[PDB]
Structure formats: structure tokens, C-alpha cells
């Protein structure tokens, strides 16, 4: 859950 | 603002503080999940996730860019790569974005 | 084959600004009025910290789009030459091509620019 | 209704920078090294030519994004006050909201700022 | 070798006997595509240039691209409804490739 | 139209 | 350098 | 401005 929500940069 | 709180959470992970932070920006990851860029006045950090139960604070604009809030309950999880993420579970908005009007100080990214 | 190997030496020696090199950010440090961000950059061959970010690009730093290990293309820069002969690059336009999250590590084994 | 009426007077009088006004470009004139552009802007109520474009934004002028009659939002500016008391606005960051072609005309009936 | 002052002259009086040497600054397709060009004479730049459809191969095979220098051998000037004048490029020769020029020449400003 | 469409919008 | 620039009128 | 910024080491 958290791993996927944080794999991207905050701003695209 | 609770200057030094971001460093402390990242370095010690002491849940037992209730820091005062400024929201700098809020970005959804798309039922939305909201990730926040927060400032303690000294540092900014985007490793904040809003618990789903708090979504109405964002959607009704209580929690928005430049508002000042106090965090009452949060937890720190560490990812596999060693990065820490803060999950915000309970908070209160002390001053609205409109009342504050601007970014407070000149915070720089947490870099340690 | 991701980085413009040799671009750092080329800028320091020639001073020409008609290239759009692809570089990796190694570290970013503020000089503190808005902060001014100084960057330690790599071209895969060399590293050098003679890079200043135009303040218009501070949001890329502050929103963490530009951070350590990201790969970026420099679309516009200016060179200034100090009294002491050091060239300083002011980064005027850049595009993050791959996030720090996606790259994950320093690319290769660059050494400090030393000529 | 599209322009930040009264923002020019606010800036000239109060000198505060915590606003992001929407203005119309009336004309742009180079003072000629990169050229430096000076702008005559309108907030729908007043016009004023005491605007200088940051060098970083020059490509917007050169690519015609920023041109006569376009509507833009100012995201960051700096106020400087001359010895003689005149205030000058340095436009640091802006976004063109509507092209000159899209707008097509000068909006409303602004008069020169005169206080 | 740019024909400094040629764009201003063509926009004022439209003398099709000027065979100007110009630099291409950028090329944008309008969707077969029609190519619009931002051109420079070293003094001014202007985007009021359309390439005749028959010259599309020059763009598509990269002979005509940003920074190349070309000579216009044949053009016509049209006037739109709003009074804006547009040059249709009918015959040109690329004198120096984008790669050989390498850079925008001079500090041209928009034709005003 | 014809040429009016090509010039209808800004260059960029 | 703003002082120098502002010594002239917009058009002149 | 730049001379003053570059007077210090990257890591200070």
C-alpha cells in the first residue's frame, strides 16, 4: 500500500 | 512552527510530539489519496501521507496550501529502501490558508 | 549511455552554451530572502559543484522533483567566469527526465573535475 | 473581470509581493548580451510600464508566448524602489493564461497609473 | 551572413525581390501537416511564415530544422482579415545545416 | 480560412 | 542598473 | 553575487 504510494516523485 | 520537528521525526521517529507544521502543497495520487509537502519552518519534506479518514479536511479546503496545522496522531513507517514516510491520522487546522496568506520563512528540503 | 559524458570539461574549458547536456544530480545544498541552490552535478565522467540554480527553478527543488540522483537535461544555461578563473554555470531551464526514485543510485564512478 | 483590477496601485503603494495578479501585456520593448525586456502592463484599471522581465523569462518573449494582448498570471515578482521614489517591478515567474491571438484586443479601458 | 533588417522590410513593403538569408529558430506543425516557422534575420524574429506544402520534404528529412541557415528564393506575402501579413515560403535553399551552425545567431528581438 | 487557420493560434 | 534603465521613457 | 556565493566550499 505505502510502497506504491511513494514509488513516484511528489510532483510527477 | 515546530522548527526541527521534521529532522526529529526522520531521525528518531518519536511519535510522542505534537508538532505545528505548515502545509506547503497537497497532491493527490489517483478514490484519491493525498500526499503533503509540509514545513516546520526550517525544512520541507513530502514524505507525508494523509489517512483516508482525513480526506474531508482536504476536500472541504480546511487543509490546503499555506494553512497551519497541529499534528495530534501520526506514525512513521520505513520503506524497503530506507526512506521514512509519515502517516497523518489526526490533526487540527489552527489557521486557514487565507489567514496565513504566505509560506512562512524560507524552509529548505530535509537533506540528512 | 544516459549522461553527456565530457560535457562538464567542455563547459569549463570552452565556455560554450550551445549544448543541452544530460546530467545526474549528486547533491543539492542551499546557500541562505529565498534560498539559492548550489548543485554538485555529474556527467558520468566528472563531478563538479560550480552550478547555481536560477531561482525560477527553486520549485523543482522544493517540491523534490529535482533531488539527489535524478537525471536531468539542461535546456538553457549561462556561464560566468570569476576573477579567479573558475567558470560557474547558472542553470536557467531544465527538465527532470528520470526521478531520483527511478534512478535510485549514482551512475558510474565519476571523479572530481580536476584540470 | 479577467484582470486583477487594482493590483498595480496595490503594488505601487504598498509594495507587497504576496499576490499573484492576473495582468494583460499591452506592449513589450527591448532595451538592447541578452536583451532586457520592459513591459507596459494592464490590470484592467491602470497601465504602467515600470515592469522588467527577468532574463530567465526571455524565451517566453522570443517564442511569442508573452506578446501584446496576452493575459498572464504573475507567480513571483520583486519590487525595487529607486532613489527618486519610483517603484519598479521585476517579473520573476509567470504563466501565460491566454495567448494574444486568443484575447485579440486590449481588455477594457485602463488609464495610466497616476498617483 | 543573415540579412539583418530583411524581415522588417518585407513586413513593411513586401518586396519579393529581397532574397533574404534567414535562420530557422523553430518549426511547428499544424495538423498532412502544414509547417509554420519562427525565423530570424539576426535582428528580428517572427513566426508569420508558412512553408508551402511542396517543401514539406525539407522539414521531414531534417534539411530544414532549428538553427539551420537558408536563403529564400521565392516567397509571397498575404494579408489576413485582421491585417496581419504572412509570408508563404515557396522556394528555398538550405545553406548551412542546423548541425554546422550549432547555435542561434545573434540576439534578435520580436518584430514589433 | 486556409491560411487563417494556420495563423489562428499562437506559434507555441 | 534599474536606475539607468528607468532614466528613459518606455518608447524613447 | 556569484563571487560571494563561490567564496565558500560546497559543504561549507
Numbering used by the authors:
A (entry chain F), G (entry chain G), H (entry chain H): 6 to 17
B (entry chain C): 5 to 34, 39 to 120
C (entry chain A), D (entry chain B): 3 to 34, 38 to 120
E (entry chain D): 4 to 34, 39 to 119
F (entry chain E): 5 to 16
From the paper:
Dna2 has nuclease and helicase activities and plays key roles in maintaining genomic integrity. It is involved in the nucleolytic processing of 5’ flaps during Okazaki fragment maturation, of DNA double-strand breaks (DSBs) during homologous-recombination mediated repair, and of stalled replication forks in the intra-S-phase checkpoint. Dna2 contains a PD-(D/E)XK superfamily nuclease motif and a 5’ to 3’ helicase domain. It is a ssDNA endonuclease that requires a free end for cleavage, and does not cleave dsDNA, single-stranded gaps, D-loops or RNA.
We co-crystallized a human Dna2 peptide (residues 1 to 20) containing the α1 helix with the OBN domain of human Rpa70 (residues 1 to 120). In the 1.6 Å structure, residues 6 to 17 of Dna2 form a 2-turn amphipathic helix followed by a β turn, while the rest are disordered. The peptide binds to a shallow OBN groove that corresponds to the DNA-binding grooves of other OB domains. The amphipathic helix of Dna2 overlaps with one of the p53 peptides, while the β turn coincides with part of the other p53 peptide. The mixed basic and hydrophobic character of the OBN groove complements the acidic-hydrophobic nature of the Dna2 peptide. Four arginine guanidinium groups and one backbone amide group of OBN contact two side chain carboxylate and three backbone carbonyl groups from α1. One of these OBN arginine residues (Arg43) splits the otherwise hydrophobic groove, demarcating two hydrophobic pockets. One pocket (Ile33, Met57, Leu87, Val93 and Ile95) binds to the hydrophobic face of the Dna2 helix (Leu7, Leu10 and Met11), while the other pocket (Leu45 and aliphatic portions of Arg31, Arg43, and Ser54) binds to Phe15 and Trp16 from the β turn of Dna2. Using ITC, we found that the Dna2 α1 helix (residues 1 to 20) binds to the OBN domain of Rpa70 (residues 1 to 120; thereafter Rpa70N), while the Dna2 OB domain (residues 21 to 122) binds to the Rpa70 fragment containing DBD-A and DBD-B (residues 181 to 422; thereafter Rpa70AB), with Kd values of 34 ± 7 and 46 ± 10 μM, respectively.
